[PDB]
Design a protein around this ligand. Structure first.
Ligand SMILES: CCCCCCCCCCCCCCC(=O)OC[C@H](COP(=O)(O)OCC[N+](C)(C)C)OC(=O)CCCCCCCCC
Ligand SMILES: CCCCCCCCCCCCCCC(=O)OC[C@H](COP(=O)(O)OCC[N+](C)(C)C)OC(=O)CCCCCCCCC
Ligand SMILES: [Fe+3]
Ligand SMILES: [Fe+3]
Lengths: 309, 309
C-alpha cells in the first residue's frame, strides 16, 4: 500500500497539523507537521500494522503512567545527542570545554541545603554505606581557583536509589544532595558514601522496551554535578567510579573520557585519623574548570521541569 | 552546526537501537531505528532546542498519566490514516466495502449485556434523554438478510459521556452499550436516547495540544458499531447524526459519506403506539452490509487493548 505521497494524505497532514487554522502556535504546528509526516511515512515504509500501532499507543500510556519518559529519553540516546550538538556548537565557537559536559539525568531536585566549602551529604541510614570523601577545586576560565562557585552534587545510595525517587518508601529529604559554595581556595569537600550503579525499574516500561532491543538498563556508579558561577556558563556533568562494570557500557551513554575517576581506599590509621572518619574510607578528587559566557549569555543552560522541594 | 549525517551519530543510532545486539525483537529494533533516526534528524532540521525538547518529554508523561494517548491518536489523524490504508488494501484485493469502515475510537468496552433482535440500552437515568429507536437490517456478502449476526453498539449520553469513562460517575456498568444478535429476519432494533457530541476533556493533554494547533476537540453526535458474523469480516463503523454542526468538522476525522444518518422525529400518537413509546421520539434506520472473509481470514480485524469488565 502506497498512499503517503498522494494529495489526499498530504493535504490531510496539513489539516491535522492546523497549518490551515489561524489560531495556535506556529512553532508547535511546524514541529507537529514534520513529526506527523515522518511517522505517517514510517508507517508506510515499514508497513506498520494497526495491531503494531496500537501496541505502540498502549506503550505510550504506560510510559507516562509510570512517569518514565525522562528515563526512556536518555536510554534512547536523546540526552547524549543533545550534548553532542552542544559540543559541536562550542567547537564551532572555538570554546574549549576543559571539563566535558554530560547528561543531567531526570533525578535532580532543587532546594538542597547549602553550606560553604564542606558538608556531609548522607544521613548514615544506608547500612552498607562505605564512607567517601569527595573533594576538589573549581577553576575559572583562566585556570584560577574560583571561590564562591556553587557546586551542586547528588547521587544514589548503595542500592542505586536517589532521595525523592526511592521506590522503597522514604529517605530523609535531600539525602545525598547538597549545594556547596567553594571556599577561599575555590575548593569544595564533601563526606558522603560510595554510590552503587542505578538500574531501571525492572518491570517498568523503559526496561520493557530496552529488553526488546536486547539492551540492559544499567548505569555505572556515578555522581552528578551542577557548577555555576558569575561570568561563567552553568556546567552539567558527572563522574563515574573507575572500575565499574558499566563504565563503558552505560545505558544512558553519559560516560566520557575525563569523567572517570578512581576512588582510592584508605585503611591506615594515619589517613583515617587525619580526615577524622570512624574507619576505612574511599577518597576521590575531582576538579572542574568552567567556561566563560558567550557574549554575556549562557548559550547552553537548559530549562527543563525539575522537582522542587 | 549539523552532525546528524556524521559517522558518529549514525553509528550511535545503531547502538541505541540495539541493531548489533544479539537478543531482542528485530521488528522492534527496525521500527525504533527508523523512528529515532527521523526524530534525531527532525531535531536538527527544525533546530529544536533542549528547552523545547524537554517540554515535549514532559507532555509525553502527562499524556500517559492521563491515559489519553488513544484520544490524541485519532485527533492527529492516525486512526483515520490507518483506515485509509485498510481501504487501499481492500481496493487492491478487489473488495467492495458496501458499508464503509471508520474509526473504533478508544472507548469500546467488552462484556456488554447480550440479547436477540431487540434491546433497550439506556436505563432512563439521563434527565434530558430523547427516546431514539435505531433499527436496521444486516446483510451478508451476497445481499441477503443475515440472522444471528452480532451487532455491538455503544454511544455517549446527552452529556457526551460514555459509561465506564464518565467523570461524573453517574452511569451503571454498560449503560448505552449492548450486543444484539440479529433475529430471523436479519434485523436488530434498539431503544436508546439520542447521543450528544463528544468533547475531549478541556483540561486534558489532548485538548491542550489541540489548542496549540488552533483546533477544537469536538466530535459530532455519533453511534459506534461492531458487527461480526461467521464467514464475514468484523465491521467497525459508526453513524453520524445528520445536522450536527461538527459532522464535517470532526476532530477525529471519522465522518464519511454513507455514514451520516437522519434522525426522523415522530410526533403523532399513531407512531408512538406502534413503537411502544411514552411520547415523541426520534427514529434512525441504518442497514449494514458485511464483507466475506478472504480465504477464511479476516485480514483487517484489529487486536488492540480494550477495557473488559
Ligand atoms: C499518539 C501517537 C503515538 C504514535 C506512536 C508511534 C508509532 C508506534 C510504532 C509501533 C511499534 C510497534 C512494535 C511493537 C510490537 O509489534 O510488539 C512489541 C512488544 C510486544 O512483545 P511481544 O512478545 O510480541 O508481545 C506479545 C506476546 N504474546 C505473543 C505471547 C502475546 O511490546 C512493546 O511494548 C514494544 C512497543 C515499543 C514501541 C514504542 C515506540 C515509542 C518510542 C518513542
Ligand atoms: C521518548 C521521548 C520521545 C520524545 C519525543 C520528543 C518530541 C520532539 C520535540 C517536541 C518539541 C515540542 C516543542 C514545544 C515547545 O517548544 O513549547 C510547547 C508548549 C509550551 O507552551 P508555551 O506557551 O510555548 O510555553 C511557554 C510560556 N512562556 C513563553 C511564557 C515561557 O506546550 C506543549 O504542550 C508542547 C507539546 C509538544 C507535543 C509533542 C508531541 C509529540 C507526540 C506525537
Ligand atoms: Fe544519576
Ligand atoms: Fe465515540
Amino acid at each position: 500500500v502506497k498512499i503517503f505521497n498522494t494529495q489526499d494524505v498530504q493535504d490531510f497532514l496539513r489539516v491535522a497539523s492546523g497549518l490551515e487554522q489561524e489560531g495556535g502556535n506556529p512553532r508547535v504546528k511546524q514541529i507537529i507537521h514534520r513529526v506527523l509526516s515522518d511517522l505517517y511515512k514510517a508507517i508506510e515504509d515499514l508497513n506498520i500494522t494497526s495491531d503494531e500501532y496500537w501496541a505502540g499507543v498502549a506503550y505510550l500510556n504506560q510510559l507516562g503512567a509510570n512517569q518514565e519518559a525522562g528515563l526512556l529519553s536518555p536510554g534512547l540516546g536523546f540526552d547524549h545527542y543533545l550534548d553532542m550538538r552542544m559540543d559541536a556548537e562550542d567547537a564551532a565557537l572555538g570554546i574549549e570545554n576543559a571539563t566535558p559536559r554530560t547528561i543531567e539525568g531526570p533525578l535532580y531536585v532543587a532546594g538542597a541545603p547549602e553550606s560553604v566549602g564542606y558538608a556531609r551529604m548522607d544521613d548514615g541510614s544506608d547500612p552498607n554505606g562505605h564512607t567517601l570523601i569527595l573533594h576538589g577545586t573549581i577553576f575559572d576560565a583562566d585556570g584560577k581557583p574560583l571561590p564562591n562557585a556553587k557546586v551542586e552534587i547528588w547521587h544514589a545510595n548503595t542500592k542505586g536509589f536517589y532521595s525523592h525517587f526511592d521506590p522503597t518508601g522514604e529517605q530523609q529529604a535531600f539525602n545525598m544532595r547538597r549545594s556547596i559554595i567553594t571556599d577561599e581556595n575555590g575548593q569544595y569537600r564533601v563526606r558522603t558514601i560510595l554510590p552503587a550503579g542505578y538500574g531501571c525499574p525492572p518491570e517498568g516500561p523503559t526496561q520493557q522496551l530496552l529488553n526488546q532491543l536486547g539492551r540492559h538498563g544499567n548505569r555505572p556508579a556515578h555522581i552528578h554535578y551542577f557548577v555555576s558561577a558569575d561570568g561563567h556558563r552553568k556546567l552539567t556533568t558527572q563522574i563515574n567510579v573507575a572500575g565499574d562494570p558499566y563504565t563503558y557500557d552505560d545505558f544512558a551513554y553519559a560516560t566520557r573520557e575525563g569523567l572517570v575517576v578512581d576512588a582510592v581506599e584508605h585503611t591506615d590509621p594515619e589517613a583515617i585519623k587525619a580526615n577524622d572518619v570512624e574507619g576505612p574510607f574511599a577518597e576521590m578528587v575531582f576538579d572542574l574548570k568552567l567556561t566563560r559566557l558567550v557574549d554575556g549569555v549562557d548559550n547552553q543552560v537548559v530549562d527543563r521541569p525539575r522537582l522542587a522541594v
